[PDB]
Symmetry: C4
Subunit: 356 residues, 4 copies
């Protein structure tokens, strides 16, 4: 598919965009108070325990073999996996297999189902959610927001009438698993998290700018068909809430949330920063795709590296476990500091909130 081709092989990772993660420093503790072998990376993911506080977030036959590779490696490492949109599989019986195998190959890890928010204004509802969940015996379902991508694509247009949320709220009352609302690379602001929260959504995946740039992907699609919209997309390459800013806004405005910090997480250090900032876990998509494309051992080496990097940051902050990481001392500098200040985030009360 053209989207996968562009994302994996063109220069669109963080193109003219920023996570603001470089504005976050984890304070080095020269006397850690622990040994490396005592570091415990285990944490809760709803009703299950996972081995490392990171998930693979959703990415849409050839698509099913990447999904297979990702799922088996995720299972091995005890990390949760989101699948990409299950709309095609809801509609076409054939496509059901390229999702199913996930649970054949990953019996124990949390698996998160996926449908787009715009589908809720287009006839999708309780049944479809139940089908997407059943299809992979999912432990949760992610509902994704991608208005920026939809705005810049040749075809169709974004529809996010409030009805979607009213329906989602109804759905949440009969679903057997939790709902996560996630972005797709442009981030969740406090106004959006408060709005979602007001309809009963308590679980968020920031998916901020700085990682996969979908506006850049549509720019490329546009250039490829000589569409003038490409020039317009260029103006919006840096559009969105940066991941680090998104983590703060969501944690601040809904302190009881379960929070995935994703969008440009490219190292275990990035993952450690996201968690220390306020996330409960870090999410990754694009670098998982690129490694899985190289093959199973490449993705295994990828996760070994991400996990080493995470434990390195844990060790060097004297953080024996994830709960300790979430309260370790940080510095916030530069644009992220200015962002937080303008946005009314009292850093003093932020600190308190991130640490509880």
């Amino acid at each position: 598919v053209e989207h996968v081709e562009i994302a994996a092989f063109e220069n669109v990772d963080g193109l003219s965009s920023s996570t603001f993660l470089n504005d976050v420093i984890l304070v080095h503790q020269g006397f850690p108070g622990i040994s490396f072998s005592e570091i415990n990376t285990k944490t809760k993911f709803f009703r299950k325990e996972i081995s490392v506080p990171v998930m693979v977030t959703g990415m849409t036959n050839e698509l099913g073999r990447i999904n297979k590779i990702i799922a088996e490696v995720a299972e091995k490492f005890g990390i949760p996996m989101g699948v990409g949109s299950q709309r095609v599989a809801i509609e076409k019986a054939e496509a059901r297999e390229s999702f199913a195998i996930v649970r054949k190959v990953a019996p124990t890890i949390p698996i998160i189902a996926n449908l787009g928010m715009p589908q809720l204004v287009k006839g999708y509802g309780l049944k479809e959610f139940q089908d997407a969940i059943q299809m992979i015996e999912a432990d949760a379902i992610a509902v994704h927001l991608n208005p920026a991508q939809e705005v810049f694509q040749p075809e169709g247009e974004p529809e996010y009438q409030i009805y979607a949320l009213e329906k989602l709220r109804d759905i949440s009352k009969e679903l057997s698993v939790p709902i996560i609302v996630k972005e797709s690379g442009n981030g969740i602001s406090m106004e959006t998290a408060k709005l979602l929260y007001s309809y009963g959504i308590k679980n968020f995946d920031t998916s901020g700018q700085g990682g996969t740039n979908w506006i850049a992907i549509e720019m490329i699609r546009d250039i490829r068909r000589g569409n003038w919209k490409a020039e317009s997309a260029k103006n919006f390459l840096d559009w969105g809430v940066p991941t680090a800013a998104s983590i703060m806004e969501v944690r601040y405005s809904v302190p009881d949330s379960f929070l995935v910090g994703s969008g440009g997480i490219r190292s275990g250090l990035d993952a450690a920063k996201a968690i220390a900032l306020g996330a409960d876990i870090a999410g990754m998509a694009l670098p998982v795709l690129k490694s899985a494309i190289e093959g199973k051992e490449s993705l295994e080496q990828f996760f070994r590296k991400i996990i080493f990097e995470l434990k390195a940051a844990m060790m060097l902050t004297g953080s024996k476990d994830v709960d300790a990481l979430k309260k370790t001392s940080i510095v916030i500098l530069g644009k992220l500091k200015e962002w937080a200040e303008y946005r009314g985030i009292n850093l003093s009360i932020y600190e308190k909130v991130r640490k509880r």
Copy 2:
């Protein structure tokens, strides 16, 4: 004409200058609450409704055909258009046509007459103003300030005594249509807006630095004649109030103003930022000229793009209409923030005023 030749084909657009608009961020809303097709870009321009909150601002035989192109396309898109200085048409009856074509080809949109503050200093009075208006059946008249251009031009030297403002006030009480006071690239400060406001001026067009650089144009003219003033002009290339700062200072110092945010507006995103910051409409001149020179179809495509970009910023901020855009969430960072703080602009109270 030399000035048009230099503006169109030399490197004078934003030369060593800045709008400060890069310090303005529109907060992305992942659940916009609207569909793209419900976005309404209509707004008021004095007694008329326009289709988009953007105007072409004034730009001075061959200058009549560019005006004709601009005017038929502005009519098509339902956007207001200011003409360039009518001085030559007051002084020569034969220059009237290159303005009279405007109303034949654009019978319904607001059309804004144009005379200089220099003409008012020099004994233009009511009749000249009435004649400029009648010549194009104008819906208002813009009076331009260009002391910087006058300072640096090979020939002549500016006069801006308060007697001209006494004249303007006298004229305004007998005119059939409102007066807009606009700059020409170097922007309107709070002192200047307040002074004008004390003389009954309520409508402003910021025309701040960052776009067409008239000091740069005169520097080039000076270079061309081997005039030593070109070195002095170079020291002044970054002179003036940046467009974003000017929007802020005028809205802050005259809360009730009708305000055009102009000077370096080059995209529908720039336009959306200017309006969200505090302008009622965005103005553009130079890129409209450059597209009109290419032709009617080039300029039609230019406007479709501006409009698409505007609506994309409204969609992605959850702004269903121009009133909502005016109150959407922003971040102010960097030098603009330092500018505002130094100039006594409480950013807390600024938010209140811009949202009303």
Copy 3:
């Protein structure tokens, strides 16, 4: 002489240093409320009136012809002129003419004698000071501080003991003309100004970093002799109080001072900024020397250029005279803002002070 050779023809103007004047913005006024021909640049210099608020500051047969040129042009333009150090003329009768000529060629302007603070640590006293004054019928005497130069020069080491100030205080009591204390490229701090003030010094010339870099001059002298001190000098190239910061410190700590704002003043805009910030007049040395070396007509053109640029800044700020310019609206940003804040300069009470 080697110092003039290096200053005039090597890369030492602003080398790795900064005036901080780029952090000072004069607020553009689109309706100035004055005309260009009514602008009055006349100001006071002790008991004389000068035509422009700028002086040539001191610069050390061939040295007497550059002085002669500078003096005749300064007389022509009505601007005060400091001579360079008169030590050699106190020490040798023959060296007197290369100064004396000054007063033959420049009978009316203020002329400022020059002796070093190192001469006061070394046994110059009243008579030597009187002789320096009489030799050129000076209207004031400058005593220069150059400890950085002395530190890094190949030969010898600085002495700035307190008895030299006791001596200056005593001398000042029997002198017929005022004493100005000036630096030589490294700027005057509030601690230094307050100390000088406690001994009766009322008149200061900032000579801050960002213009002529004397540490760079000595570095080059050191390099030219294979002297290892060159590498040490390199580490101190950005040593000193930037001119803009020095102006603020002296104005704030000695509000009643007469203040020359100098050190890196390279245009009439620089000069206008220095005065707006708090100086009574601006000072220049190096670019005058460079022009003088090309000849009298070149220097005449240089002054015409400086004056035009000063009047342009006055015009475009609506400042009818120097007193108006001193209270015109400014913006302070960036490092200078941070400098001022850290040094306890409340930017609100600073405004009050500079405006009186």
Copy 4:
């Protein structure tokens, strides 16, 4: 030895790291109030007086000759010298000489022993400490922290259980000399300083980032071995507390500490800055190694240069002695300013603490 090979000949000094000392400005005093020849650089180092407030910090048969050169030059200049880790000398009776020579060739200066904190959880205790000290007749012992280096090295893992401090605390009551706790290039934070202080540690050596980058050194070791941990070390090159930030944090959090400011000290201006910021003395390692390798006269010239540079900064700040330097006027700007602010270092109570 590989670590010396890499430190001395690869690009690892300040690689992707920063001391933050460029954010510290010493205020120039154009009238110093002292002479160069009167400047007194003597200061206390526990029970001894040293000639200059700088030490050589510890660096680990050809390792002995470098040590012998360093020690004899340090003796000549009256500067204290730390040795590298004595672990091998404890285990191997042959290695004792390459440390003991130090004391034959430097009978009078303070000599500082060295063992690593992780040894305390691996069998080392009072006896090994007494041994280390006796072997070189030490005046103090340094216990080093190098967790970041141990994390990234091919072989092994960092062990810093609290037991190590419990043991160290016991040892401290029976040792005949003081204990200094030092980092090794990644700096000491307030949490770590306060933790050490709670176990009785009063003496600290910041060894902050910006100088020798041990994560970089291990990265190169990993590269050379084809180890994938190299890619992970690259992610951590800028990890740690910058030297200037560490000096502020330790002085702030343990105001009566004896404090060595080290990590990236490369000139006497860096040393002066470190001292004025709040250190008692400055420490250097890498540049001493590099000079020692070139030979005795090179190292002699190096110290001459450092000392001249320190006295230059003392002269130019009007600091007659080390006590005066510690209270001289400074400006803190930029990232260091932001770091201190985030970390709750009230810059006003900081000023008091560092000046007492």
